[PDB]
């Protein structure tokens, strides 16, 4: 057997290519039921969710369970959370050259474990991010804007590259609040990709 790490704080070194070798800290959100070697992790200070085979990936150095802080959190106002979950939004970020940019996105769910945080993805950056979005909302930085397939979990998928060959992956989750939206893990990357099968931006997905 092995110890559970879901819901735990973790730390490990990270050695990739010739990149500087660093020590990472984060929180394990999820052990993917359909592929239990795969864990979803929220790393401290890093916005995008990571999907890593934490016990198999050679880049992971000496995985440790931490006890530095409570891992979990909960939502202040669940009713308020329910008004943004499942909604298309404009999510404001600071612009590169001043002002703020409206990033079009979709609030997907409250995250597991870190329940004060929300899963969100973006039209221009369709991977999985996590923020404490009720903070954005209170500050005026989150504005609400005024293809379901059964049995997809675990299905292999390929995506057409501009280079011409196929990007290979697996469907790992279906979003409850918007069941035409799925999470995909591709073999070549740690991001969790989010696709809405009702959208033309998904026509490129082959099952």
């Amino acid at each position: 057997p092995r110890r559970n790490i879901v819901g735990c704080r973790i730390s490990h070194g990270w050695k990739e290519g010739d990149e500087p070798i660093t020590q990472w800290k984060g929180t394990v959100l999820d052990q993917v039921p359909i592929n239990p070697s795969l864990y979803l992790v929220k790393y401290d200070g890093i916005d995008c969710v990571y999907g890593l085979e934490l016990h198999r990936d050679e880049r992971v150095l000496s995985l440790k369970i931490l006890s530095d802080r409570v891992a979990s959190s909960h939502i202040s106002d669940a009713n308020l959370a329910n008004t943004i979950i499942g909604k298309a939004v404009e999510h404001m970020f600071e612009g590169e050259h001043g002002s703020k940019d409206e990033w079009r996105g979709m609030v997907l769910a409250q995250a597991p474990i870190m329940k004060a945080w929300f899963y969100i993805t973006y039209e221009k950056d369709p991977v999985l991010y996590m923020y404490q979005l009720l903070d954005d909302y209170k500050e005026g930085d989150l504005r609400i804007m005024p293809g379901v397939v059964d049995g997809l979990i675990g299905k292999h998928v390929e995506y057409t590259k501009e280079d011409g060959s196929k990007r290979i992956g697996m469907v790992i989750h279906q979003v409850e609040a918007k069941p035409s939206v799925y999470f995909i893990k591709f073999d070549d990357d740690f991001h969790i990709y989010v696709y809405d099968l009702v959208k033309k931006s998904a026509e490129n997905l082959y099952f």
């Binding site: 890093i46 404001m92 970020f93 600071e94 923020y131 954005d136 930085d141």
Partner: peptide, 8 residues
């Protein structure tokens, strides 16, 4: 608002 992170 938040600052967008660089890719790491």
């Amino acid at each position: 608002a938040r600052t967008k992170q660089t890719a790491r």
